[PDB]
Paper text:
We performed protein engineering on Lsd18 to improve its thermostability and catalytic activity. Screening of these mutants using thermal shift assay identified stabilized variants Lsd18-T189M, Lsd18-S195M, and the double mutant Lsd18-T189M-S195M.
We found that the Tm values of Lsd18-T189M, Lsd18-S195M, and Lsd18-T189M-S195M were increased by 3.0 °C, 4.5 °C, and 4.8 °C, respectively. In order to reveal the structural basis for the higher thermostability of the best two mutants, we solved the crystal structures of Lsd18-S195M and Lsd18-T189M-S195M at the resolution of 2.50 Å and 3.76 Å, respectively. Although the resolution of the second structure was not high, the secondary structure was clear enough for analysis. Comparing the structures of Lsd18 WT, Lsd18-S195M, and Lsd18-T189M-S195M, it can be seen that the angle of the α helix between L408 and T419 shifts, which is in agreement with the MD study. Furthermore, the loop region R314-L316, E208-F210 and C398-Q401 in Lsd18 WT change to a β sheet in the two mutants’ crystal structures, also indicating that this region is less flexible and more stable. T189 formed hydrogen bonds with D187 and G192. After mutating to M189, the hydrogen bond with G192 was weakened, while there were hydrophobic interactions between M189 and L26 as well as P194. More importantly, M189 forms a hydrogen bond with the cofactor FAD that could stabilize the binding of this cofactor.
Residue numbers in the entry: 20 to 487
The structure:
Amino acid sequence: TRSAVVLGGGMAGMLVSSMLARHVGSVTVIDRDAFPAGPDLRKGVPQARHAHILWSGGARIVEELLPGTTDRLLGAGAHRIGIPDGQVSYTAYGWQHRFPEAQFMIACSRALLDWTVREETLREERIALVEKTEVLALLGDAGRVTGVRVRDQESGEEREVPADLVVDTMGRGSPMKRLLAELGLPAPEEEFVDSGMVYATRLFRAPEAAATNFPLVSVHADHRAGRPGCNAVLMPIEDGRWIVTVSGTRGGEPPADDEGFARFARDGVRHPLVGELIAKAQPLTSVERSRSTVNRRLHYDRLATWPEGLVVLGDAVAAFNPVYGHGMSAAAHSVLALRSQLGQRAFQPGLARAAQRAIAVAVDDAWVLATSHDIGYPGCRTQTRDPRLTRHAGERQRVTDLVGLTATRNQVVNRAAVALNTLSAGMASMQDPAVMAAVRRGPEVPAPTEPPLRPDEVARLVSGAGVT
Ligand SMILES: Cc1cc2nc3c(=O)[nH]c(=O)nc-3n(C[C@H](O)[C@H](O)[C@H](O)COP(=O)(O)OP(=O)(O)OC[C@H]3O[C@@H](n4cnc5c(N)ncnc54)[C@H](O)[C@@H]3O)c2cc1C
Protein backbone atom coordinates (compact mmCIF):
# COMPACT_ATOMS: atom_id res chain seq x y z
CA THR A 1 0.00 0.00 0.00
CA ARG A 2 1.29 3.44 1.13
CA SER A 3 0.65 6.69 -0.75
CA ALA A 4 2.68 9.91 -0.95
CA VAL A 5 1.96 13.43 -2.19
CA VAL A 6 4.69 15.86 -3.26
CA LEU A 7 3.83 19.57 -3.36
CA GLY A 8 5.75 21.22 -6.18
CA GLY A 9 7.49 19.92 -9.27
CA GLY A 10 10.88 21.62 -9.17
CA MET A 11 14.30 20.06 -8.69
CA ALA A 12 13.27 19.02 -5.18
CA GLY A 13 9.80 17.71 -6.06
CA MET A 14 10.97 15.56 -8.98
CA LEU A 15 13.94 14.12 -7.07
CA VAL A 16 11.98 13.21 -3.93
CA SER A 17 9.22 11.75 -6.11
CA SER A 18 11.75 9.51 -7.88
CA MET A 19 12.92 8.27 -4.46
CA LEU A 20 9.45 7.93 -2.92
CA ALA A 21 8.04 6.06 -5.94
CA ARG A 22 10.39 3.19 -5.01
CA HIS A 23 9.08 3.31 -1.42
CA VAL A 24 5.30 3.88 -1.75
CA GLY A 25 2.47 3.18 -4.17
CA SER A 26 1.11 6.40 -5.69
CA VAL A 27 2.89 9.77 -5.85
CA THR A 28 0.80 12.80 -6.84
CA VAL A 29 2.89 15.85 -7.75
CA ILE A 30 0.86 19.06 -7.36
CA ASP A 31 1.82 22.41 -8.87
CA ARG A 32 0.20 25.71 -9.84
CA ASP A 33 2.19 26.25 -13.05
CA ALA A 34 2.19 25.13 -16.69
CA PHE A 35 4.84 22.48 -17.31
CA PRO A 36 6.18 22.58 -20.89
CA ALA A 37 6.83 19.57 -23.10
CA GLY A 38 10.09 21.20 -24.19
CA PRO A 39 13.03 22.77 -22.32
CA ASP A 40 11.32 26.20 -22.18
CA LEU A 41 11.40 28.85 -19.47
CA ARG A 42 8.68 28.54 -16.84
CA LYS A 43 6.93 31.06 -14.61
CA GLY A 44 7.19 29.03 -11.40
CA VAL A 45 10.95 28.80 -11.97
CA PRO A 46 12.02 32.36 -12.89
CA GLN A 47 15.59 31.51 -11.84
CA ALA A 48 15.92 29.57 -15.13
CA ARG A 49 17.06 32.72 -16.95
CA HIS A 50 20.22 32.69 -14.82
CA ALA A 51 22.71 29.83 -14.99
CA HIS A 52 22.72 27.20 -12.26
CA ILE A 53 25.78 25.30 -11.06
CA LEU A 54 25.26 21.61 -10.27
CA TRP A 55 28.25 20.58 -8.18
CA SER A 56 29.60 17.03 -8.13
CA GLY A 57 27.78 16.11 -4.92
CA GLY A 58 24.41 17.06 -6.37
CA ALA A 59 25.34 15.65 -9.77
CA ARG A 60 26.00 12.05 -8.68
CA ILE A 61 22.98 12.23 -6.38
CA VAL A 62 20.70 13.17 -9.28
CA GLU A 63 22.37 10.38 -11.26
CA GLU A 64 21.79 7.87 -8.45
CA LEU A 65 18.07 8.70 -8.27
CA LEU A 66 17.76 9.24 -12.06
CA PRO A 67 20.06 6.86 -13.96
CA GLY A 68 20.77 8.16 -17.44
CA THR A 69 20.50 11.88 -16.65
CA THR A 70 24.20 12.82 -16.85
CA ASP A 71 24.72 11.26 -20.29
CA ARG A 72 21.39 12.60 -21.55
CA LEU A 73 22.41 16.04 -20.30
CA LEU A 74 25.88 15.55 -21.80
CA GLY A 75 24.17 14.69 -25.10
CA ALA A 76 21.88 17.72 -25.23
CA GLY A 77 24.87 20.10 -25.13
CA ALA A 78 25.75 20.20 -21.42
CA HIS A 79 29.43 20.13 -20.48
CA ARG A 80 31.12 18.14 -17.72
CA ILE A 81 33.55 20.81 -16.55
CA GLY A 82 36.17 19.38 -14.21
CA ILE A 83 37.45 21.03 -11.05
CA PRO A 84 39.82 22.67 -10.89
CA ASP A 85 41.27 21.66 -14.27
CA GLY A 86 38.39 23.30 -16.14
CA GLN A 87 37.97 26.55 -14.22
CA VAL A 88 39.89 29.83 -14.40
CA SER A 89 38.72 31.49 -11.18
CA TYR A 90 40.23 34.55 -9.49
CA THR A 91 39.65 33.61 -5.86
CA ALA A 92 39.81 36.02 -2.93
CA TYR A 93 43.33 34.69 -2.24
CA GLY A 94 44.69 34.71 -5.82
CA TRP A 95 44.41 32.65 -8.98
CA GLN A 96 43.32 29.02 -8.62
CA HIS A 97 46.09 26.87 -10.09
CA ARG A 98 44.43 24.32 -12.36
CA PHE A 99 45.21 20.98 -10.74
CA PRO A 100 44.06 17.64 -12.18
CA GLU A 101 40.41 16.62 -11.90
CA ALA A 102 39.34 16.43 -8.24
CA GLN A 103 35.58 17.06 -8.54
CA PHE A 104 33.32 18.10 -11.41
CA MET A 105 30.20 20.09 -12.29
CA ILE A 106 27.35 20.09 -14.81
CA ALA A 107 26.94 23.34 -16.75
CA CYS A 108 23.67 23.87 -18.62
CA SER A 109 20.72 26.25 -18.66
CA ARG A 110 18.39 25.50 -15.75
CA ALA A 111 15.49 25.10 -18.20
CA LEU A 112 17.16 22.00 -19.64
CA LEU A 113 18.25 20.57 -16.28
CA ASP A 114 14.73 20.89 -14.86
CA TRP A 115 13.43 19.11 -17.97
CA THR A 116 15.98 16.28 -18.14
CA VAL A 117 15.18 15.66 -14.47
CA ARG A 118 11.42 15.88 -15.10
CA GLU A 119 11.06 13.73 -18.24
CA GLU A 120 13.34 11.14 -16.62
CA THR A 121 11.41 11.15 -13.33
CA LEU A 122 8.05 10.87 -15.12
CA ARG A 123 9.14 7.57 -16.70
CA GLU A 124 7.63 5.79 -13.68
CA GLU A 125 3.91 5.07 -14.06
CA ARG A 126 3.26 5.63 -10.33
CA ILE A 127 4.20 9.33 -10.35
CA ALA A 128 1.17 11.31 -11.56
CA LEU A 129 2.00 14.89 -12.52
CA VAL A 130 -0.86 17.33 -11.83
CA GLU A 131 -0.23 20.80 -13.29
CA LYS A 132 -2.11 24.10 -12.97
CA THR A 133 -3.56 23.16 -9.57
CA GLU A 134 -3.48 25.51 -6.58
CA VAL A 135 -3.04 24.26 -3.01
CA LEU A 136 -5.48 25.59 -0.40
CA ALA A 137 -4.93 23.80 2.92
CA LEU A 138 -3.45 20.72 4.58
CA LEU A 139 -5.75 17.85 5.52
CA GLY A 140 -5.65 16.55 9.08
CA ASP A 141 -4.85 18.19 12.42
CA ALA A 142 -1.81 19.34 14.40
CA GLY A 143 -0.75 15.76 15.13
CA ARG A 144 -1.15 14.02 11.77
CA VAL A 145 -1.43 15.40 8.23
CA THR A 146 -3.36 13.12 5.88
CA GLY A 147 -3.26 15.03 2.59
CA VAL A 148 -4.03 18.27 0.77
CA ARG A 149 -7.13 20.13 -0.43
CA VAL A 150 -6.34 21.35 -3.95
CA ARG A 151 -8.40 23.07 -6.65
CA ASP A 152 -7.93 23.15 -10.42
CA GLN A 153 -7.49 26.63 -11.88
CA GLU A 154 -9.07 25.72 -15.23
CA SER A 155 -12.23 24.05 -13.89
CA GLY A 156 -12.54 25.43 -10.36
CA GLU A 157 -13.42 22.04 -8.86
CA GLU A 158 -12.14 21.38 -5.34
CA ARG A 159 -11.15 17.96 -4.03
CA GLU A 160 -9.25 16.20 -1.23
CA VAL A 161 -6.03 14.40 -2.19
CA PRO A 162 -4.94 12.25 0.79
CA ALA A 163 -1.61 10.53 1.37
CA ASP A 164 0.50 8.93 4.08
CA LEU A 165 3.30 11.46 3.51
CA VAL A 166 2.99 15.11 2.47
CA VAL A 167 6.14 16.60 0.94
CA ASP A 168 6.66 20.35 0.56
CA THR A 169 8.94 21.24 -2.37
CA MET A 170 7.43 24.68 -3.04
CA GLY A 171 10.66 26.61 -3.68
CA ARG A 172 11.73 29.77 -1.85
CA GLY A 173 8.18 31.15 -1.90
CA SER A 174 6.83 28.21 0.09
CA PRO A 175 3.41 29.07 1.55
CA MET A 176 4.16 26.34 4.14
CA LYS A 177 3.91 29.00 6.86
CA ARG A 178 0.34 29.79 5.79
CA LEU A 179 -0.66 26.14 5.30
CA LEU A 180 0.84 25.27 8.70
CA ALA A 181 -0.78 28.23 10.49
CA GLU A 182 -4.26 27.20 9.36
CA LEU A 183 -3.40 23.74 10.72
CA GLY A 184 -2.80 25.22 14.18
CA LEU A 185 0.93 25.62 14.84
CA PRO A 186 3.22 28.56 15.77
CA ALA A 187 5.83 30.15 13.51
CA PRO A 188 9.23 28.53 12.96
CA GLU A 189 12.50 30.02 14.14
CA GLU A 190 13.20 32.12 11.06
CA GLU A 191 16.93 32.56 10.44
CA PHE A 192 18.36 34.58 7.57
CA VAL A 193 21.61 36.24 6.51
CA ASP A 194 20.74 39.08 4.12
CA SER A 195 23.78 40.37 2.27
CA GLY A 196 21.55 42.01 -0.34
CA MET A 197 23.12 40.33 -3.36
CA VAL A 198 21.66 41.33 -6.74
CA TYR A 199 22.05 38.88 -9.61
CA ALA A 200 22.51 40.06 -13.21
CA THR A 201 22.66 37.44 -15.98
CA ARG A 202 22.81 37.98 -19.74
CA LEU A 203 23.28 35.31 -22.40
CA PHE A 204 26.31 35.41 -24.70
CA ARG A 205 26.90 33.52 -27.95
CA ALA A 206 30.32 31.92 -27.56
CA PRO A 207 32.79 32.16 -30.46
CA GLU A 208 32.58 29.38 -33.03
CA ALA A 209 35.83 27.84 -31.79
CA ALA A 210 34.88 27.86 -28.09
CA ALA A 211 31.45 26.25 -28.49
CA THR A 212 32.69 23.09 -26.75
CA ASN A 213 35.45 22.52 -24.17
CA PHE A 214 35.69 25.93 -22.53
CA PRO A 215 36.50 26.38 -18.83
CA LEU A 216 34.28 27.82 -16.12
CA VAL A 217 35.61 31.39 -15.84
CA SER A 218 34.89 33.54 -12.79
CA VAL A 219 36.34 36.48 -10.86
CA HIS A 220 35.52 36.39 -7.16
CA ALA A 221 35.39 39.04 -4.43
CA ASP A 222 37.45 39.31 -1.24
CA HIS A 223 35.18 38.62 1.75
CA ARG A 224 37.91 40.03 4.03
CA ALA A 225 37.83 43.45 2.33
CA GLY A 226 35.58 46.30 3.40
CA ARG A 227 34.22 46.92 -0.11
CA PRO A 228 30.86 45.57 -1.34
CA GLY A 229 31.74 42.18 -2.74
CA CYS A 230 31.00 41.64 -6.41
CA ASN A 231 31.71 38.58 -8.55
CA ALA A 232 31.48 37.69 -12.24
CA VAL A 233 31.07 34.20 -13.75
CA LEU A 234 31.27 32.97 -17.36
CA MET A 235 30.06 29.40 -17.67
CA PRO A 236 29.23 27.66 -20.98
CA ILE A 237 25.89 25.97 -21.56
CA GLU A 238 24.11 24.11 -24.36
CA ASP A 239 23.85 25.02 -28.07
CA GLY A 240 27.26 26.69 -27.84
CA ARG A 241 26.34 29.66 -25.64
CA TRP A 242 27.92 31.43 -22.68
CA ILE A 243 26.19 32.59 -19.50
CA VAL A 244 27.89 35.70 -18.13
CA THR A 245 26.75 36.56 -14.60
CA VAL A 246 27.70 39.50 -12.40
CA SER A 247 26.62 40.01 -8.80
CA GLY A 248 26.85 42.58 -6.04
CA THR A 249 25.73 43.25 -2.46
CA ARG A 250 24.02 46.27 -0.89
CA GLY A 251 26.19 49.19 -2.03
CA GLY A 252 27.66 47.84 -5.28
CA GLU A 253 24.69 46.50 -7.22
CA PRO A 254 25.11 45.88 -10.97
CA PRO A 255 23.20 48.07 -13.43
CA ALA A 256 20.13 47.22 -15.50
CA ASP A 257 21.14 48.79 -18.83
CA ASP A 258 22.83 46.54 -21.38
CA GLU A 259 25.66 49.03 -21.97
CA GLY A 260 26.53 49.14 -18.26
CA PHE A 261 26.53 45.38 -17.75
CA ALA A 262 29.55 44.97 -20.05
CA ARG A 263 31.27 47.57 -17.83
CA PHE A 264 30.57 45.96 -14.45
CA ALA A 265 32.05 42.70 -15.76
CA ARG A 266 35.39 44.46 -16.40
CA ASP A 267 35.21 47.67 -14.33
CA GLY A 268 33.62 46.58 -11.03
CA VAL A 269 35.14 43.21 -10.20
CA ARG A 270 38.67 42.66 -8.90
CA HIS A 271 39.89 41.53 -12.34
CA PRO A 272 38.60 42.51 -15.83
CA LEU A 273 38.78 39.02 -17.34
CA VAL A 274 35.15 38.14 -18.16
CA GLY A 275 34.73 41.63 -19.61
CA GLU A 276 37.41 40.75 -22.16
CA LEU A 277 35.89 37.32 -22.81
CA ILE A 278 32.52 38.89 -23.67
CA ALA A 279 34.05 41.22 -26.27
CA LYS A 280 34.78 38.03 -28.31
CA ALA A 281 31.06 37.10 -28.13
CA GLN A 282 27.69 37.92 -29.70
CA PRO A 283 25.14 39.33 -27.22
CA LEU A 284 21.64 37.87 -27.52
CA THR A 285 19.35 39.06 -24.69
CA SER A 286 19.29 41.91 -22.18
CA VAL A 287 20.06 41.96 -18.46
CA GLU A 288 17.49 40.00 -16.42
CA ARG A 289 18.27 40.77 -12.78
CA SER A 290 16.95 38.80 -9.81
CA ARG A 291 17.05 40.11 -6.24
CA SER A 292 15.68 37.05 -4.37
CA THR A 293 19.21 36.05 -3.32
CA VAL A 294 18.97 35.94 0.48
CA ASN A 295 19.90 32.95 2.62
CA ARG A 296 16.77 32.12 4.64
CA ARG A 297 16.32 29.01 6.78
CA LEU A 298 13.10 28.03 8.57
CA HIS A 299 13.90 25.55 11.35
CA TYR A 300 10.76 23.42 11.32
CA ASP A 301 12.91 20.74 12.97
CA ARG A 302 13.15 22.60 16.30
CA LEU A 303 9.41 23.25 16.59
CA ALA A 304 7.63 22.31 19.81
CA THR A 305 5.16 20.18 17.83
CA TRP A 306 5.21 18.76 14.31
CA PRO A 307 2.50 16.76 12.52
CA GLU A 308 3.10 13.21 11.37
CA GLY A 309 3.34 12.79 7.61
CA LEU A 310 4.67 16.30 6.88
CA VAL A 311 8.20 16.79 5.51
CA VAL A 312 9.77 20.01 4.19
CA LEU A 313 12.89 20.02 2.01
CA GLY A 314 14.40 21.89 -0.91
CA ASP A 315 14.25 25.69 -0.89
CA ALA A 316 11.28 25.56 1.50
CA VAL A 317 13.38 24.82 4.59
CA ALA A 318 16.78 26.31 3.62
CA ALA A 319 17.54 28.51 0.60
CA PHE A 320 21.01 29.96 0.01
CA ASN A 321 22.97 32.54 -1.95
CA PRO A 322 23.30 31.70 -5.68
CA VAL A 323 26.87 33.00 -6.08
CA TYR A 324 28.12 29.83 -4.35
CA GLY A 325 25.79 27.41 -6.13
CA HIS A 326 24.60 24.89 -3.53
CA GLY A 327 20.80 25.06 -3.91
CA MET A 328 20.51 21.93 -6.05
CA SER A 329 23.01 19.86 -4.07
CA ALA A 330 21.36 20.77 -0.75
CA ALA A 331 18.01 19.62 -2.15
CA ALA A 332 19.56 16.43 -3.54
CA HIS A 333 21.29 15.74 -0.22
CA SER A 334 17.99 16.44 1.55
CA VAL A 335 16.21 13.79 -0.54
CA LEU A 336 18.83 11.24 0.53
CA ALA A 337 18.22 12.33 4.14
CA LEU A 338 14.55 11.39 3.75
CA ARG A 339 15.51 8.09 2.10
CA SER A 340 18.04 7.38 4.89
CA GLN A 341 15.11 7.93 7.23
CA LEU A 342 12.48 5.88 5.35
CA GLY A 343 14.50 2.66 5.51
CA GLN A 344 15.00 2.85 9.27
CA ARG A 345 11.56 3.86 10.56
CA ALA A 346 9.47 2.69 7.57
CA PHE A 347 6.13 4.50 7.94
CA GLN A 348 5.97 4.46 11.76
CA PRO A 349 5.32 7.47 14.01
CA GLY A 350 8.34 9.73 14.31
CA LEU A 351 9.01 9.84 10.57
CA ALA A 352 8.37 13.57 10.22
CA ARG A 353 10.34 14.45 13.36
CA ALA A 354 13.24 12.26 12.18
CA ALA A 355 13.15 13.24 8.50
CA GLN A 356 13.13 16.96 9.31
CA ARG A 357 16.03 16.62 11.75
CA ALA A 358 17.84 14.58 9.09
CA ILE A 359 17.15 17.26 6.48
CA ALA A 360 18.50 19.79 9.01
CA VAL A 361 21.92 18.12 9.01
CA ALA A 362 21.88 17.56 5.24
CA VAL A 363 21.84 21.32 4.52
CA ASP A 364 24.03 22.36 7.47
CA ASP A 365 27.13 22.42 5.26
CA ALA A 366 25.34 24.42 2.56
CA TRP A 367 24.21 26.86 5.27
CA VAL A 368 27.61 27.58 6.85
CA LEU A 369 29.53 27.82 3.55
CA ALA A 370 26.95 30.35 2.35
CA THR A 371 26.68 32.58 5.42
CA SER A 372 30.29 32.28 6.63
CA HIS A 373 31.38 34.53 3.75
CA ASP A 374 28.29 36.75 3.58
CA ILE A 375 28.44 37.87 7.24
CA GLY A 376 31.64 39.83 6.56
CA TYR A 377 30.01 42.13 4.01
CA PRO A 378 28.98 45.73 4.74
CA GLY A 379 25.57 46.58 6.15
CA CYS A 380 24.23 43.02 6.04
CA ARG A 381 21.14 42.51 8.20
CA THR A 382 21.31 39.04 9.76
CA GLN A 383 18.77 37.41 12.08
CA THR A 384 20.57 34.29 13.30
CA ARG A 385 21.29 32.76 16.70
CA ASP A 386 23.65 29.88 15.86
CA PRO A 387 27.00 30.68 17.55
CA ARG A 388 28.99 29.66 14.44
CA LEU A 389 28.11 33.10 13.01
CA THR A 390 27.96 35.29 16.16
CA ARG A 391 30.74 34.70 18.68
CA HIS A 392 33.95 32.79 17.88
CA ALA A 393 33.11 33.39 14.21
CA GLY A 394 36.59 34.86 13.76
CA GLU A 395 38.34 31.53 14.24
CA ARG A 396 35.86 30.08 11.75
CA GLN A 397 36.90 32.98 9.51
CA ARG A 398 40.62 32.73 10.31
CA VAL A 399 40.86 29.05 9.35
CA THR A 400 38.72 29.16 6.19
CA ASP A 401 40.94 31.98 4.92
CA LEU A 402 44.01 29.77 5.43
CA VAL A 403 42.47 26.68 3.81
CA GLY A 404 41.29 28.66 0.80
CA LEU A 405 44.60 30.52 0.53
CA THR A 406 46.60 27.28 0.45
CA ALA A 407 44.10 25.48 -1.81
CA THR A 408 45.06 27.87 -4.61
CA ARG A 409 48.64 26.53 -4.57
CA ASN A 410 48.38 23.08 -2.94
CA GLN A 411 46.83 19.98 -4.51
CA VAL A 412 46.05 18.02 -1.33
CA VAL A 413 44.37 21.03 0.30
CA ASN A 414 42.58 21.87 -2.96
CA ARG A 415 41.35 18.31 -3.55
CA ALA A 416 40.02 18.30 0.02
CA ALA A 417 38.52 21.78 -0.41
CA VAL A 418 36.45 21.24 -3.56
CA ALA A 419 35.39 17.91 -2.07
CA LEU A 420 33.59 20.00 0.58
CA ASN A 421 32.70 23.27 -1.18
CA THR A 422 31.09 21.21 -3.97
CA LEU A 423 29.10 19.28 -1.31
CA SER A 424 30.84 15.94 -1.85
CA ALA A 425 32.12 15.41 1.71
CA GLY A 426 31.60 16.78 5.22
CA MET A 427 33.05 19.65 7.25
CA ALA A 428 34.76 17.05 9.45
CA SER A 429 36.81 15.88 6.45
CA MET A 430 38.59 19.26 6.55
CA GLN A 431 40.10 18.12 9.87
CA ASP A 432 41.94 15.20 8.26
CA PRO A 433 45.44 14.81 9.79
CA ALA A 434 46.79 14.79 6.21
CA VAL A 435 44.94 18.02 5.37
CA MET A 436 46.04 20.01 8.42
CA ALA A 437 49.53 18.72 7.61
CA ALA A 438 49.24 19.79 3.97
CA VAL A 439 48.11 23.25 5.09
CA ARG A 440 51.29 23.51 7.17
CA ARG A 441 53.34 22.22 4.22
CA GLY A 442 52.51 25.43 2.35
CA PRO A 443 52.12 26.21 -1.34
CA GLU A 444 53.64 23.80 -3.85
CA VAL A 445 53.17 25.89 -7.03
CA PRO A 446 53.82 29.60 -7.65
CA ALA A 447 50.84 31.94 -7.75
CA PRO A 448 49.91 32.72 -11.38
CA THR A 449 50.41 36.37 -12.29
CA GLU A 450 48.05 36.09 -15.29
CA PRO A 451 44.78 34.21 -15.89
CA PRO A 452 45.84 30.54 -16.04
CA LEU A 453 44.27 30.20 -19.49
CA ARG A 454 45.71 27.49 -21.71
CA PRO A 455 46.95 28.56 -25.16
CA ASP A 456 44.64 26.04 -26.86
CA GLU A 457 41.79 27.80 -25.00
CA VAL A 458 42.66 31.44 -25.72
CA ALA A 459 43.28 30.51 -29.37
CA ARG A 460 39.65 29.30 -29.36
CA LEU A 461 38.28 32.85 -29.06
CA VAL A 462 38.73 34.03 -32.67
CA SER A 463 37.40 32.51 -35.87
CA GLY A 464 40.48 33.41 -37.92
CA ALA A 465 38.54 33.27 -41.19
CA GLY A 466 39.71 36.72 -42.31
CA VAL A 467 43.15 35.63 -43.52
CA THR A 468 44.76 33.80 -46.44
C1 LIG B 1 18.77 33.54 -9.33
C2 LIG B 1 19.03 32.19 -8.71
C3 LIG B 1 20.20 31.51 -9.02
C4 LIG B 1 20.47 30.26 -8.46
N1 LIG B 1 21.66 29.62 -8.78
C5 LIG B 1 21.90 28.45 -8.26
C6 LIG B 1 23.14 27.78 -8.60
O1 LIG B 1 24.01 28.22 -9.35
N2 LIG B 1 23.29 26.55 -7.99
C7 LIG B 1 22.39 25.94 -7.13
O2 LIG B 1 22.67 24.83 -6.67
N3 LIG B 1 21.23 26.58 -6.82
C8 LIG B 1 21.00 27.77 -7.36
N4 LIG B 1 19.83 28.41 -7.05
C9 LIG B 1 18.88 27.75 -6.14
C10 LIG B 1 17.95 26.78 -6.85
O3 LIG B 1 17.17 27.47 -7.83
C11 LIG B 1 17.01 26.14 -5.83
O4 LIG B 1 17.77 25.72 -4.70
C12 LIG B 1 16.22 24.95 -6.37
O5 LIG B 1 15.31 25.41 -7.38
C13 LIG B 1 15.47 24.21 -5.28
O6 LIG B 1 14.39 23.46 -5.88
P1 LIG B 1 12.92 23.57 -5.33
O7 LIG B 1 12.02 22.55 -6.03
O8 LIG B 1 12.91 23.50 -3.85
O9 LIG B 1 12.46 25.01 -5.81
P2 LIG B 1 12.00 25.36 -7.28
O10 LIG B 1 12.99 24.72 -8.25
O11 LIG B 1 11.84 26.83 -7.43
O12 LIG B 1 10.60 24.64 -7.42
C14 LIG B 1 9.39 25.24 -6.90
C15 LIG B 1 8.21 24.53 -7.50
O13 LIG B 1 7.03 24.76 -6.69
C16 LIG B 1 6.00 25.31 -7.49
N5 LIG B 1 5.23 26.24 -6.68
C17 LIG B 1 5.63 27.46 -6.20
N6 LIG B 1 4.72 28.09 -5.50
C18 LIG B 1 3.64 27.23 -5.51
C19 LIG B 1 2.35 27.31 -4.95
N7 LIG B 1 1.92 28.34 -4.23
N8 LIG B 1 1.51 26.27 -5.15
C20 LIG B 1 1.94 25.23 -5.87
N9 LIG B 1 3.12 25.04 -6.45
C21 LIG B 1 3.94 26.08 -6.24
C22 LIG B 1 6.69 25.94 -8.69
O14 LIG B 1 5.81 26.01 -9.80
C23 LIG B 1 7.84 24.95 -8.92
O15 LIG B 1 7.43 23.84 -9.70
C24 LIG B 1 19.53 29.68 -7.59
C25 LIG B 1 18.35 30.35 -7.29
C26 LIG B 1 18.09 31.60 -7.84
C27 LIG B 1 16.81 32.31 -7.50
